[PDB]
Amino acid sequence: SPFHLNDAVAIVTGAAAGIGRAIAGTFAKAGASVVVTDLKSEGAEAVAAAIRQAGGKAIGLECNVTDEQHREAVIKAALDQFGKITVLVNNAGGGGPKPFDMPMSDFEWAFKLNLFSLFRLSQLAAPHMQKAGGGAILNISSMAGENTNVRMASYGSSKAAVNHLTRNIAFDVGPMGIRVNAIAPGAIKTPEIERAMLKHTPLGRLGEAQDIANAALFLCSPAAAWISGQVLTVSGGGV
Amino acid sequence: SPFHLNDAVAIVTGAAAGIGRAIAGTFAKAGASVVVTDLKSEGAEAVAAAIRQAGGKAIGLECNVTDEQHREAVIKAALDQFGKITVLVNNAGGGGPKPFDMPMSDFEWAFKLNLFSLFRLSQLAAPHMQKAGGGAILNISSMAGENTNVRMASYGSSKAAVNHLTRNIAFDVGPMGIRVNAIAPGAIKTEIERAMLKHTPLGRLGEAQDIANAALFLCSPAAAWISGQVLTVSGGGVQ
């Protein structure tokens, strides 16, 4: 089963709760040494210590992905602790419904958070994946980069930019042996309104962060060795 | 024929040469009062004077679309000269192939130029279009918003961001009577040309007047129920 990605070093951003925590835990179970980072040092350290207790190799750091101080800190810490970089999970990001008439201070924030940070991180990690023989980048997007809705002037543009950045820098770092892929999660269970939102989800249930973790583990694994420039939507079949 | 632009005021950015200049001329021939703008004052003034000589209403302005001073200046100049704003053609933009290991500054300038500028322009122009009973915004994108290629880390991401911004802010400014559409131009006229046409099934390159007429359709009452759409004017292929 090339589904082990055992011999590797995976930097997971925003990985103290939810999708990032699940990705870190599942990657560690698969044999990868995990640099858990978060905006909060305490949560990342907690998750990393839990992984070490389970029997895995992990460290926990504070990283504001928008702060190049913190980005070089994470890259250097991964290199010091484990010697190489082979997987980069850009799960760090946020933003939400901001009205059309918003400050531009809110539009540039959406792109510095959801796009600029992860591009700079991929720039930082790509050379180390090169003497390492190749690596896997995974940007965690959203279903707003494909769908069209109100109040999504900032979030949606940023997520579609993440998607096409994936599709394009698949071509630049391919020669380096690096695969760029993205995951678009939707309605993840971190109630008539809940069943009303399930009425458009054909599988009749909400998704667990293990679903995204599983999809990521596939995309970051040797089983996805000839898969790049792909956005995979994990949505149960709907929006 | 509802393909005329009578009682219309059209702001056209980057319109001293090429697609923008042809759009300004075609829109003026359609009966629209044209605020031609450019980064260089001389070209915009020349194009506006030529339009006035041809029998249309036009003014020429210097505008760096990345400069909010210039943006408010264009909005106020349009409202002074012609009393309203009904059409906003964001043709101004640029960038191109940059390396993956490109400097971070380079990567923000293509968003600030190719996205942030036109979003702030649409923000400034939306209240006046609402007041004028509705209008049309047209973002001049590029075929890199859809295609995947090398060196397109910044240009492609910004252009796909423009595409999805079009698609989504069609939903916010819809209630205002405003239609947002986008044009993706192919190779334009201004043995690798033979590769170009190996691809382009119509066996010729496109004239700036093709983009001009596509824009004229999308900014006219003929397209009154068309919004959130990206029209690719490529002759039927990719160049």
Side-chain angles (χ1 to χ4, degrees):
Chain A
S1 132
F3 299 74
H4 58 101
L5 62 80
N6 269 304
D7 210 14
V9 179
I11 310 178
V12 190
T13 71
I19 291 181
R21 171 176 67 192
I23 282 179
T26 301
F27 280 37
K29 279 273 175 191
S33 298
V34 177
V35 189
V36 187
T37 78
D38 193 346
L39 197 39
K40 290 308 271 308
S41 172
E42 48 179 335
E45 295 181 345
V47 174
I51 285 171
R52 275 186 307 252
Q53 279 189 346
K57 284 157 190 145
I59 74 179
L61 311 175
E62 187 209 324
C63 201
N64 190 7
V65 278
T66 71
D67 204 310
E68 185 144 5
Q69 282 333 80
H70 295 208
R71 301 197 275 264
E72 284 183 10
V74 173
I75 301 298
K76 292 181 64 178
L79 281 175
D80 302 351
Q81 267 289 310
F82 302 112
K84 57 168 177 175
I85 302 172
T86 61
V87 164
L88 175 69
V89 174
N90 299 290
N91 178 45
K98 285 189 238 245
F100 170 69
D101 72 350
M102 48 159 114
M104 209 109 301
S105 82
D106 291 16
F107 199 65
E108 284 117 9
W109 178 248
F111 282 68
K112 273 180 231 177
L113 181 53
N114 288 327
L115 182 57
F116 291 164
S117 63
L118 66 70
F119 180 52
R120 192 37 190 167
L121 261 177
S122 317
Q123 273 189 339
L124 288 188
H128 307 103
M129 305 178 162
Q130 191 167 2
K131 314 163 111 283
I137 306 167
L138 186 88
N139 308 325
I140 277 35
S141 230
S142 195
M143 303 224 318
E146 282 305 307
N147 314 326
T148 68
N149 206 41
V150 193
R151 297 287 290 243
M152 293 292 188
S154 67
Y155 197 61
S157 305
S158 54
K159 293 316 197 181
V162 181
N163 292 355
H164 205 44
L165 180 69
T166 302
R167 291 180 197 101
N168 285 263
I169 75 175
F171 274 86
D172 302 1
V173 307
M176 328 200 189
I178 301 178
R179 314 178 321 268
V180 194
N181 305 299
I183 298 264
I188 271 60
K189 228 183 138 114
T190 223
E192 291 205 306
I193 189 158
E194 178 263 341
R195 292 288 178 185
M197 104 188 23
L198 260 62
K199 257 193 257 189
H200 292 338
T201 296
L203 285 176
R205 80 162 157 91
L206 266 203
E208 316 303 330
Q210 211 51 245
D211 285 296
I212 311 307
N214 296 328
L217 177 56
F218 167 67
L219 285 193
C220 284
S221 67
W226 200 57
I227 301 174
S228 201
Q230 287 304 302
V231 190
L232 179 73
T233 299
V234 183
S235 78
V239 305
Chain B
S1 182
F3 294 86
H4 282 237
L5 306 191
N6 323 303
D7 287 326
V9 190
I11 308 180
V12 188
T13 74
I19 293 184
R21 165 179 64 188
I23 284 176
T26 305
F27 278 41
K29 279 274 180 193
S33 292
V34 179
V35 180
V36 186
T37 80
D38 200 353
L39 190 48
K40 301 299 290 298
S41 182
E42 44 182 345
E45 290 183 0
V47 169
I51 284 166
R52 274 186 313 252
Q53 280 182 334
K57 273 156 209 133
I59 74 185
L61 301 177
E62 180 213 336
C63 200
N64 188 0
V65 289
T66 74
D67 181 338
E68 180 134 10
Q69 295 301 89
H70 289 209
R71 302 200 278 255
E72 280 180 18
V74 173
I75 303 301
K76 297 174 67 160
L79 295 173
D80 300 336
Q81 268 289 312
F82 303 117
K84 58 182 177 162
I85 296 170
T86 52
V87 159
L88 181 55
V89 168
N90 299 284
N91 179 45
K98 296 183 204 279
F100 174 99
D101 77 347
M102 89 200 48
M104 163 95 328
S105 89
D106 277 21
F107 200 64
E108 270 119 3
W109 174 244
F111 280 60
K112 272 179 227 181
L113 170 66
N114 290 337
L115 184 60
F116 293 174
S117 77
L118 61 72
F119 183 57
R120 191 52 196 158
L121 268 175
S122 309
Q123 253 180 12
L124 300 188
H128 307 102
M129 300 204 207
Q130 178 177 51
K131 181 78 184 309
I137 301 147
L138 182 83
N139 297 331
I140 295 297
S141 217
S142 175
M143 280 181 41
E146 280 301 322
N147 297 323
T148 68
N149 212 43
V150 195
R151 293 297 281 259
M152 297 308 198
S154 79
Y155 201 53
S157 306
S158 51
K159 280 320 180 182
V162 186
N163 288 4
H164 211 54
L165 183 70
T166 320
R167 286 185 199 99
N168 284 265
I169 69 172
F171 271 98
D172 301 354
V173 309
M176 317 199 201
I178 311 191
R179 311 173 323 260
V180 192
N181 304 280
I183 299 280
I188 39 60
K189 195 43 131 203
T190 292
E191 284 168 68
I192 278 304
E193 212 265 20
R194 274 302 102 161
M196 220 151 299
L197 264 40
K198 291 290 181 59
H199 295 303
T200 323
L202 286 182
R204 71 166 170 96
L205 282 195
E207 314 299 333
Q209 193 65 47
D210 290 301
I211 317 299
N213 292 51
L216 180 65
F217 168 65
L218 285 186
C219 293
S220 75
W225 199 53
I226 306 177
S227 177
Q229 292 296 315
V230 187
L231 186 70
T232 299
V233 179
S234 53
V238 297
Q239 304 88 358

